[PDB]
């Protein structure tokens, strides 16, 4: 509920996203190709994204 | 929770979205170009978003 507290639009979907993602990755046995299908996105698309936020 | 148990990212960025600048509108009543500058993003962007998220807007 802290993401509503955020100022920045921009910076409150990275927070989101990154809170997204890595509580997908726990529920997902912590694997990139499974993750990656599973949220919908390309491999090398997840992979430019969890270097940018985590 | 809503959103955590929704299933693909493209889905769950766009309600986040939606409900974070819904809230933003709220607490600045409904005054479009104090949201969009407070946010950071242009008018026309925050304009363009309540449109395609389908964002209720009131307050005169
Ligand atoms: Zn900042
Ligand atoms: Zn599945
Ligand atoms: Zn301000």
Same mark, same amino acid.
């Given at each position: 509920?802290? #993401? =509503? +507290?955020? @100022? $920045? &639009?921009? $910076?409150? +979907? +990275? ?7 890595? $509580? +997908? &990755? !726990? $529920?997902? %046995?912590? %694997?990139?190709? !499974? ?6 996105? %390309? =491999?090398? *698309?997840?992979? !430019?994204?969890? @270097?940018? #936020? *985590?």
């Amino acid at each position: 509920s802290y #993401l =509503l +507290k955020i @100022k $920045e &639009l921009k $910076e409150a +979907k +990275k927070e989101f996203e990154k809170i997204f993602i890595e $509580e +997908k &990755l !726990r $529920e997902y %046995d912590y %694997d990139l190709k !499974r993750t990656a299908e599973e949220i919908g996105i %390309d =491999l090398s *698309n997840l992979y !430019r994204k969890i @270097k940018s #936020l *985590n």
